[PDB]
Curated annotation (Swiss-Prot), chain B:
This is Actin-related protein 5. GO terms for molecular function: enzyme regulator activity. It comes from Saccharomyces cerevisiae (strain ATCC 204508 / S288c) (Baker's yeast). Belongs to the actin family. It comes from the Eukaryota.
Curated annotation (Swiss-Prot), chain C:
Belongs to the RuvB family. Transmembrane segments: none annotated. The chain holds residues 200 to 265 of 463 of the full protein. Present with 11600 molecules/cell in log phase SD medium. It comes from the Eukaryota. Probably forms a homohexamer. Interacts with RVB2 and may form heterododecamers with RVB2. Component of the SWR1 chromatin remodeling complex composed of at least ACT1, ARP4, RVB1, RVB2, ARP6, YAF9, VPS71, VPS72, SWC3, SWC4, SWC5, SWC7 and SWR1, and perhaps BDF1. Component of the chromatin-remodeling INO80 complex, at least composed of ARP4, ARP5, ARP8, RVB1, RVB2, TAF14, NHP10, IES1, IES3, IES4, IES6, ACT1, IES2, IES5 and INO80. Component of the R2TP complex composed of at least RVB1, RVB2, TAH1 and PIH1. Interacts with SPT15/TBP and HSP90. It is found in: Nucleus. This is RuvB-like protein 1.
Swiss-Prot record, chain D:
It is found in: Nucleus. It comes from Saccharomyces cerevisiae (strain ATCC 204508 / S288c). Component of the chromatin-remodeling INO80 complex, at least composed of ARP4, ARP5, ARP8, RVB1, RVB2, TAF14, NHP10, IES1, IES3, IES4, IES6, ACT1, IES2, IES5 and INO80. This is Chromatin-remodeling complex subunit IES6. Present with 1720 molecules/cell in log phase SD medium. Belongs to the IES6 family. Probably involved in transcription regulation via its interaction with the INO80 complex, a chromatin remodeling complex. Also involved in the regulation of telomere length. It comes from the Eukaryota.
From Swiss-Prot, chain E:
GO terms for biological process: nucleosome assembly. It comes from Xenopus laevis. There is a cross-link at residue 8 (Glycyl lysine isopeptide (Lys-Gly) (interchain with G-Cter in UFM1)). Belongs to the histone H4 family. This is Histone H4. It is found in: Nucleus; Chromosome. Its main location: nucleus.
């Protein structure tokens, strides 16, 4: 048993490019890329939460970590996508 | 001409004392414990004796005396003692209570009262509509144990003003009260306020001043100075009005013919040199011979240079967009150059990024345009830009002078600030406005159908009263009359009332209740009722609150 | 709407401007409230000829809608 | 001795007292409370 | 004119710290353009740390952590 | 009673619960809030979608139907915020973008 993200990112590619094939090595690069991005974002958030003497990770410290890591227009588009996703998910009423 | 504002001027003369010879141990005292001001005086007078803001502060001195009796009007003496003032009201309720005791001791001292075993006089007091039980029980406790008054009466200030303006005590009308922190519409039948159908909107003068502050700070984020609450308060008082129709006044407020009136302003080489000299002499001879033709040619050259520079600036702006088709063409050209000749080498050389060379070419084109303008001399406006009209009004603006760098304009806010009591959604409160609450009181209630008004509804429409301290805004009565004519059936007579000064009508209300009528004794609570019924006791009289349940 | 009392004609003018913000994009057209009274009365004089009555009473196919 | 008792929590324990009285009385409509007086949202857009 | 705060003999003082016999006259404004991006790059990561701390003052504690985040960890002011 | 996952509650195609699992036993914090995996999942959504967009346009730019690592390399190195983010990582089997200095050309 081993874990990969392959079906999800495959679906992401079929949403915008239906007639496009895939090399397995390309999944190896892109899986390493998404794991590396998750890696830096998560330890930046943990480092920031350890700074503020807090024991809890919420949306705001990863928001600040996204603002710290990503370039500015990617930062603003990423926080736009994240805020609309978390407000859609938070409307469970 | 810009008008400058400042802090309000301070009182030089200290507040006076009531005489000791005028003390009557049996006369009552009317107290209006408003959120913004306090009104205290004896019953037998018509005008309240003491008016001061409901605030106090503590003063520290180098001699270590800790004199902290700067209460009410005493805070209007110095800028330092005024800025540290603190009211007992936090929101619509009273949170702390030692300062309430200090304020009541200050006004009892200034009322010329010499007590013995507590205050020997009954007390007229107002309270918030549908107040919480803890405020009532704690008010009972302080007024019955700390001061030991013989009698206590509770009521609503809007109902007190309605009793003032019809002292028969059995009329039928509609009361609209615009207070400091809330706005209430209370229906009255036969002199008794039907509190089961009264409504409250969480908006007042304090929220209006804070809304003006937030709006004006959003309009000018790089303002050099910081302005206090009182400056926003006085330009709310002086430059705000209710529009007759907001949905028409919005669409024409920023036009040029409207902004000029109702906008307020608040503060080898030698051969080349010989050839160049010969060309300059030929140009001078052409200017002396045909100045108009040379001027037209130089103007055409300047226009061509300006058009080329505009095309270059458009290309430079289009190259910055990543999602543009020019960026896709550049990506395709990069892919083709990777895919692959002197022409191909020239294309690879010319496909390089040159931002600094683009800036140098723009500078050279500006120099050429300046040369063409000089040849034309020898031989973007703010009218259509609505952001400049919103920011700096109908006048041109320069940023290099310190006089208009400290300058503020109020054009849209003059009708935007008082409009929130009609549309509370603009302030963030999900509530109906004043007019819709009046509509659903008069039309879908009290045995009245839409299209057929009952007799009680007609008597209510004929006796509409507007009160409260926030009725000072001009244009309120005409707007209320226009909307009331809007939703009512035709032929209905609408009569509205408004004081010359609607702040003091509650004091005249309890003065006329305690003085003119002996039916004040119907609402009086004594020692024995407090001792045998407990603090959770409510007298269901015609001017106060009611029992929470049925 | 528009209702004629004598002839019973009904004409719809459009939706009111108070309901213009129920949707951002809509098919209905929006008109303001009439500034006059609801009830209006007027005296008019109709001029006809006998040929118009002869034409109106002798349509061969039948009547027509408004 | 009295607590500071800010204006936010006064609404909270008055509401919980009203709910406790209501759930005692059920296992009685209110007439005029701090939450029955508050204006409803508008019907017009 | 406030951008003219940094003075040319101070740039000369920084240059002679490097041990250079000859300085041309354009080096001063070159180093000005170099330094202007450079300090703004740590002002970028200082004031966001300050804002996430719910603070409206900066200190010696967040600026050293900004430099430690980018990669020039500095000793002397704690951290 | 049966309801689906949080990913379509947030409208995302990446697994929210797997990200929550990795954040839980990745020993980054002793307590993890509810809204953190949704935000992180949305950020990974947008990053993967943009990278796949640039790769798909690169593969269209070479008239192929498959994603070669050359397409990923040229899409990352051609664009400049992806240049700054991914400057220190070497793509396996990526190659080098074509560039010649102007003075090295046969200028004549």
């Amino acid at each position: 048993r081993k874990e990969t993200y392959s079906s999800y990112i495959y679906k992401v590619l079929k949403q915008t490019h239906p007639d496009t094939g895939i090399s397995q090595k390309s999944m190896s690069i892109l899986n390493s890329f998404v794991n590396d991005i998750f890696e830096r974002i998560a330890t930046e958030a943990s480092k920031l939460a350890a700074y503020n003497k807090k024991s809890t990770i919420s949306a705001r410290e990863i928001q600040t970590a996204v603002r710290l890591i990503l370039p500015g227009e990617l930062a603003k588009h990423a926080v736009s996508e994240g805020t609309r996703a978390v407000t859609k998910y938070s409307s469970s009423t | 001409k810009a008008v400058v504002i400042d802090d309000p001027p301070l009182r030089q003369t200290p507040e006076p004392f009531d005489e000791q010879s005028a003390y009557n141990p049996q006369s009552p005292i009317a107290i209006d414990f408003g959120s913004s001001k306090l009104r205290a005086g004896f019953v037998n007078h018509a005008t309240p004796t003491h008016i001061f803001p409901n605030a106090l502060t503590k003063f520290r001195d180098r001699k270590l005396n800790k004199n902290f009796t700067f209460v009410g009007n005493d805070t209007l003496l110095d800028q330092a003692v005024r800025s540290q003032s603190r009211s007992p009201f936090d929101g619509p309720f009273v949170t702390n209570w030692n300062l309430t005791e200090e304020i009541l001791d200050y006004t009892f001292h200034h009322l010329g009262v010499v007590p013995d075993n507590g205050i020997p006089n009954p007390i007229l007091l107002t309270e918030r509509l549908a107040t919480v039980q803890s405020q009532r029980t704690n008010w009972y406790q302080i007024l019955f144990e700390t001061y030991n008054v013989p009698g206590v009466t509770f009521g609503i200030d809007s109902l007190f003003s309605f009793y003032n303006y019809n002292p028969s005590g059995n009329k039928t009308g509609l009361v609209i009260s615009c207070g400091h922190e809330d706005t209430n519409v209370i229906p009255v039948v036969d002199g008794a306020g039907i509190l089961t159908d009264a409504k409250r909107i969480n908006w007042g003068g304090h929220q209006a001043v804070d809304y003006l502050n937030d709006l004006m700070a959003l309009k000018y984020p790089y303002f050099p100075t910081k302005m206090s609450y009182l400056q926003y308060e006085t330009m709310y008082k002086d430059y705000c009005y209710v529009s007759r129709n907001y949905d028409e006044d919005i669409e024409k407020i920023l036009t040029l013919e409207n902004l000029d009136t109702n906008d307020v302003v608040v503060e080898e080489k030698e051969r080349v040199a010989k050839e160049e000299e010969e060309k300059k002499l030929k140009e001078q001879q052409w200017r002396e011979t045909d100045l108009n033709g040379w001027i037209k040619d130089k103007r055409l050259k300047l226009n061509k240079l300006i058009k080329r520079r505009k095309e270059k600036l458009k290309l430079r702006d289009e190259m910055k967009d990543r999602k543009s088709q020019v960026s896709q063409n550049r990506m395709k050209n990069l892919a083709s150059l990777a895919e692959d000749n002197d022409e191909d080498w020239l294309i690879y050389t010319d496909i390089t990024q040159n931002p600094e060379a683009f800036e140098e070419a723009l500078e050279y084109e500006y120099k050429d345009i300046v040369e063409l303008e000089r040849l034309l001399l020898e031989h973007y406006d703010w009218r259509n830009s609505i952001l400049h009209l919103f920011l700096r009004g109908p006048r041109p603006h320069d940023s290099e002078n310190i006089h208009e760098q400290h300058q503020m304009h109020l054009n849209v806010e003059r009708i935007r600030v008082p409009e929130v009591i009609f549309q509370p959604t603009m302030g963030g409160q999900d509530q109906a406005g004043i007019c819709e609450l009046s509509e659903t009181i008069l039309l879908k209630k009290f045995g009245s159908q839409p299209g057929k008004l009952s007799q009680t509804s007609i008597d209510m429409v004929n006796n509409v009263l507007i009160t409260g301290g926030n009725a000072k805004v001009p244009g309120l009565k005409e707007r209320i009359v226009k909307e009331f004519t809007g939703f009512l059936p035709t032929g209905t007579n609408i009569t509205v009332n408004m004081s010359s000064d609607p702040s003091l009508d509650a004091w005249k209300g309890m003065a006329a209740l305690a003085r003119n009528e002996e039916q004040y004794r119907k609402t009086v609570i004594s020692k024995k009722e407090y001792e045998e019924y407990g603090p959770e006791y409510i007298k269901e009289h015609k001017l106060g609150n009611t029992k929470y349940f049925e | 709407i528009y209702i004629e009392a004598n002839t019973g004609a009904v004409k719809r003018v459009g939706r009111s401007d108070a309901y213009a913000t129920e949707f951002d994009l809509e098919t209905e057209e929006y008109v303001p409230l009439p500034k006059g009274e609801v009830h209006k009365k007027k005296e008019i004089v109709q001029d006809v000829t006998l040929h118009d009555l002869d034409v109106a009473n002798a349509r061969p196919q039948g009547g027509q809608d408004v | 001795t009295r607590r500071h008792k800010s204006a936010r929590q006064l609404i909270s324990d008055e509401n919980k007292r009203i709910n406790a009285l209501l759930t005692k009385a059920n296992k009685l409509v209110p007439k005029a409370t701090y939450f029955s007086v508050e204006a409803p949202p508008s019907i017009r857009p | 004119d406030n951008i003219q705060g940094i003075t040319k003999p101070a740039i000369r003082r920084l240059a002679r710290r490097g041990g250079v016999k000859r300085i041309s006259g354009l080096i001063y404004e070159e180093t000005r353009g170099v330094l202007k991006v450079f300090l703004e790059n740590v002002i970028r990561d200082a004031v966001t740390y300050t804002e996430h701390a719910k603070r409206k003052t900066v200190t010696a504690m967040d600026v050293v952590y900004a430099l430690k985040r980018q990669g020039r960890t500095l000793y002397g002011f704690g951290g | 009673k049966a309801s689906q996952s949080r990913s379509a509650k947030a409208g995302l195609t990446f697994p929210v619960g797997r990200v929550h699992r990795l954040l839980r036993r990745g020993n980054y914090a002793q307590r993890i809030g509810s809204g953190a995996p949704v935000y992180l999942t949305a950020v990974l959504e947008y990053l993967a979608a943009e990278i796949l967009e640039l790769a798909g346009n690169a593969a269209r730019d070479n008239k192929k139907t498959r994603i070669i690592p050359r397409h990923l390399q040229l899409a990352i190195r051609n664009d400049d915020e992806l240049n700054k983010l991914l400057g220190n990582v070497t793509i396996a089997q990526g190659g080098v973008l074509p560039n010649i200095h102007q003075n090295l050309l046969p200028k004549k």
